[PDB]
């Protein structure tokens, strides 16, 4: 990554063994459960494109996912090139999409862009592309559709709501989209005894109020 | 977070793998037992709003709780906006800026390291902990009225259950100290209750626990 | 905690994940065995009152103990207020007992007292109160009285002495008090075959000499 | 390794216990699965040739692989020597100097921190990774031609096996993207193959995986 | 401990959780096996007397041993006092000051960082290690005279037991090297003893172990 | 160890708990398998003689080995004394063999030699002696001779080669010595079906070529 030294300059630092292992382990244990994405983002704080490729490439298995991600990255890189078409001796060159993705750029080139004044934040740009690709994989690999999340006849309302919002989260539902699904489905698919209670609360009931009423 | 480096300057630092994993593991093992809140607060020492959202978002499962929390945050942001309406100069934070959803990391650092600081990390953390406390209370399984000492239950074990329940119900510290002379005695088993009655008013918890040992 | 930076000033530092987990784990594993107190003291090196409350509050369970500790702290805070009764714009205010205990003072107020010249060491004062309370809990929760520690007919003298001084330690026995109990009980409650041997050594026998003689 | 300290200077640092153990554990658990190579590269960030030899030498077992690697290193050193023939002044590195067997740590630091640097650590690492890639390929157990979707095998699981095998066989990224329209369809089971045929040319992998879900 | 910071100054640092846990775990797993002493010494690198008492006091159990240690410390403190009788100026340490029971941390730092230093941490550690060595010897279960090679016991295994026992009995290094020609042969089984006799005097341990392999 | 500070001076640093435990654990788990030596060397980076003795002395068990190592060290120290026979107030004294081995020298004496201009690298000299002794122990404790490594009738050629070069490594075989053993034994002791294949490749076949041909 790039970190700040004591002088106040942004300098390169090796990716740590703890960072490397943490990312490998979370994929091993959680695959593409939705909470892996914020973990990838946090573990890749300050990452160069090289560091981002290191993290992706240290994943063994899930190679269908990793190949889909490459295809998403190539699409995003192709769009970058469409909007930013691109040498003076000793001067900074403009990055291509594949430079941002770390496959045609050197580490020192990446550092130069990231620490430039103003910076070309190739690490942040690449990370956005990766997360776009990971979000498609999370959505693709969700085992449940929200329409099939119905409360069981003896299922605690709390457990049903957990499934409902887990499923919705895997869908990358906006707050707009998440609120539409709740309004359309949450009460309507609660079990009969809980459903009558929630209707009395009205459309303005908070989730907290609904969960208290059906406990 | 924003921490002071070894030279005296306040600088941004990445959240560490250790911090990230500690928070995930605490929720996995303890869910929303009350002691998870002080752990969240300490693990988020110096957090920017971005760091706080990272910690919340790295939790898998418990999405009913996480959605209630989001709703609490939105209420607090709306109250912030009600009290604080809004080249190269610094903008005032709205509620969604404090909550990290409409503000950038560099903007959050700008507010936090401003002179004087706008401590958006601390403000957001207060909102989050307000929401976590409501979750703790909702997921508290027992009322203090149903914690009664079993006929052969050691008084120490009963007192442990009583004050565990009280903490999850989030009785004030005053009610915790006051229940020592009222409800704690009333729900003791007959043999110990007779002993506690003889102690008279004003017995400390230590004195009650010694007397029913 | 408060640590020294490279300039030589005492500055605040976040409590570490390793510190936080170490304290939680030792209570989980050892409860109020006597050696937990020196571990609490060492893990709270340089702690602010806020850090001390964090450590106590991260304990789940043992809430009888934690409530007894609160009562001890309130007593000590009440005595502080009795001896130190207590605003100029921009100036340091004198701490109340509840300020030392971290419930009515801010972190920046605590730092100001701790780093003042001369310091008001509110962290050290509060820690003393906590350890006073923990010592009462260790003593209360000891399963054995020293009068019931007698050497078994086939028990190795070493194992008996281990039980004897474990029990005495839980009692918070002074060195004065610890020596009186040894003189009163250790030989007198050794088993007959070992007891005759130790009497011959006389009252000046070291423990080492007694343990060698009864092996 | 050679890293920049908190003041801006490039200095030698001991390889850490954490780095040492991570590398040993990765080989123990994964042997020469392809993802071990990027892990070796990152764990050897900033390595001197001495550090690289330390990491290789701390591996127990797999000595057939380690001997093949030594032979690959010797070939690369010979090609280096073919292209680069050789008081108080700095000497030029031979292949065995780059590989750390005839050069001292202080000489390696001298080359790496020279202006301009002779990056013997990076050169040696390239040779090593060339040798590790040959080991990965040799120890690849299956040909891509034998990865065929089972009649009830989920298409996702088959695609995982297909691209795992392709990676171990070290098909180029072009061949990986090209096989999506050719071999991946051909080795699908009849039911999914009919679906993929109807998709027409140009289907992305995501589109194929959705279609056979 | 007192350590030098990254700038060159000797400063106090808190004992770390890692150090604290390592010491507790070593005693839990190994009790007073002889190799625990060098581990205690290294883990207490730079320790103040306060740190040394922390490490000793964090041990649970083994209180017979800990009481013997206290008695040894008191003897050493008394000998110190016998040899060293005692506004804003520095006071001389008594034995109980060196042992950390009557001195404050700031006083201990004052002595240790004085010019010239009064190294109370090192002095106390010597006393402690003197006491730990006596505990190691007392808890040594076997005499070297009872370590004899079994009729089918590999000579290497017998030599391991012999020198483990010798270390716990704390034979000098001279006696360890001298026993190679005397007791080690005498307690070997008949078949190996005949071989060792033929080797003649002056055989190294390596030569004896090869000969009885 | 001795590490560089920010000024650029070589200063003493305490050996770390992680270093201490790593060395103890690798001996517990691996004994004197050949790869333990490079681990000892790496874990003792920058070590003083005191640190080297700490590492050796924290090993419990294997005391036959540890005593052999002492004998090797004493031999090397005796040779040092033979080549370097050895006080001015406040001046550096020349180290004896036992000073290099850390038994007659203080830590501050060792630091003075190691950080002198020019340095007397007593830590590096001692480490060489220790590794010489450990190499003799690795060789002594190898369970197999290379002459007994023959390929099984159903054993994969890869597994046979692994055993062959493991055994050779434990022998401390040079590259010269290692190549002579391969030329003498590797094909000659391959099983019949694999042996005919390798002979056709000729004496210039790489190992890679031999392993491909017999898979
Ligand atoms: Cl690390
Ligand atoms: Cl994210
Ligand atoms: Cl790769
Ligand atoms: Cl690169
Ligand atoms: Cl840009
Ligand atoms: Cl609920
Ligand atoms: Cl970390
Ligand atoms: Cl809190
Ligand atoms: Cl998220
Ligand atoms: Cl953000
Ligand atoms: Cl404000
Ligand atoms: Cl009790
Ligand atoms: Cl930590
Ligand atoms: Cl204490
Ligand atoms: Cl709390
Ligand atoms: Cl506070
Ligand atoms: Cl005061
Ligand atoms: Cl004994
Ligand atoms: Cl480390
Ligand atoms: Cl790579
Ligand atoms: Cl090696
Ligand atoms: Cl070297
Ligand atoms: Cl070059
Ligand atoms: Cl799919
Ligand atoms: Cl630590
Ligand atoms: Cl020692
Ligand atoms: Cl204690
Ligand atoms: Cl003290
Ligand atoms: Cl002195
Ligand atoms: Cl042997
Ligand atoms: Cl450490
Ligand atoms: Cl080596
Ligand atoms: Cl020792
Ligand atoms: Cl020493
Ligand atoms: Cl020399
Ligand atoms: Cl093969």
Residue numbers in the entry:
A (entry chain A), C (entry chain A), F (entry chain A): 1 to 86, 91 to 219
B (entry chain B), D (entry chain B), E (entry chain B): 1 to 86, 93 to 219
Quote from the publication.
Lenacapavir (LEN) is a long-acting, highly potent HIV-1 capsid (CA) inhibitor. The evolution of viral variants under the genetic pressure of LEN identified Q67H, N74D, and Q67H/N74D CA substitutions as the main resistance associated mutations (RAMs). Here, we determined high-resolution structures of CA hexamers containing these RAMs in the absence and presence of LEN. High-resolution co-crystal structures of LEN in a complex with cross-linked CA hexamers revealed that the inhibitor binds in a hydrophobic pocket formed by two adjacent CA subunits.
To elucidate the structural basis for how the N74D CA change confers resistance to LEN, we have determined the X-ray crystal structures of cross-linked CA(N74D) hexamers in the absence and presence of LEN at 1.97 and 3.32 Å resolutions, respectively. The overall secondary structures of CA(N74D) and CA(N74D) + LEN are highly similar to those of their WT counterparts. Yet, the structure of the N74D mutant protein has not been reported previously. Here, we present X-ray crystal structures of CA hexamers containing the N74D substitution in the presence and absence of LEN, which reveal structural bases for both LEN resistance and deleterious effects of this CA substitution on CPSF6 and SEC24C binding. Second, the N74D substitution results in a significantly more negative surface potential at this site, and its vicinity to the LEN binding site could adversely influence inhibitor binding (compare panels C and D in Fig. 3). Asp74 interacts with Lys70 in unliganded CA(Q67H/N74D) but not in the CA(N74D) structure. In addition, the CA substitution would introduce electrostatic repulsions between the side chain oxygen of Asp74 and the main chain carbonyl oxygen of the Leu315 of CPSF6 or the Leu230 of SEC24C.
